[PDB]
Structures are given as C-alpha cells and as structure tokens.
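so im writing up the methods section and need the 2-amino-4-hydroxy-6-hydroxymethyldihydropteridine pyrophosphokinase record in one place, dumping it here so i stop losing it
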Amino acid sequence: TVAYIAIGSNLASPLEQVNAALKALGDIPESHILTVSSFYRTPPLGPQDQPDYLNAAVALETSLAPEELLNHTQRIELQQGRVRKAERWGPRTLDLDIMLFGNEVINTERLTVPHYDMKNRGFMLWPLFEIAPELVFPDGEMLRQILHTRAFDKLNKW
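--- predicted struct ---
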C-alpha cells in the first residue's frame, strides 16, 4: 500500500539529516521507496529562529503501518543525525509523519490517513502534490489545495 511520510529536517546541512530517514525508509523490512522529490526550504517560526530547513515529500509502499514505519525512520534519526544525545538542541534531527495510508480510513496516533494539521502545513502537502496530485480522497481534498486555502499556496523549491 502507498503511504506518505513527509520528512522534515533542518540545521546548517540538512542533507545528512534527511539521508538518515532515506536510509531506513530506503529498504524497510517490507517497505520500498516509490516517489520522493520536491526539495525546498521552510522557516522555523517557533522551534527555532534560524531559517533554512530542507523538507521533501516521500511516498513508499509500506506493508507495516506508520506505527512500525516511523519507528525505523526515526530510529536512524535517533542514532544518526547527531543525536549524540537527542540532537542535543533544537536544529538537526528528523521529523517525518504519515499523511496517508493507502487512501483508506484509519486514524489513531502514529497513523492518520485524513491527516491533521495538514491544512496548516504547506511544507508537506505541496511537495507530495508534485509527486502525486490526485490523493485527495483521504479526506476529500488533495494536499496543496488544502494548504492553498489554509496555509500558503506554493513554497520555493529551496
């Protein structure tokens, strides 16, 4: 089933951080990357004050619910992106959540197809909108069109 794991990451060189997830997410026990692109920048506004970041949408065919999925992804983020002790400070680390899960309906905590906070998260829906602008169904609305009327309209490609 095609799932969506929008990876975040930031700090000076987010290239390494992002790659952390790309590693596990790359060859997960039963998952496999399918569509991943749309690299851009996002302003901290809250967690930090250092503008940079490097977000990119990902959609791989995972056989294990985001529960296990995220475990592996953040697993690397828990022993790769610095994390010599929980990334120490604000910047760095990874933050990839699941947006959809086969377009079906399944909400819990680690998994939520309808996906919350999406509307106010143009830096997660817009990217995947490039690799697949037909999801919508999950909640009845696409990804960018929700942020287009709620969040932004189209962020810059880094």
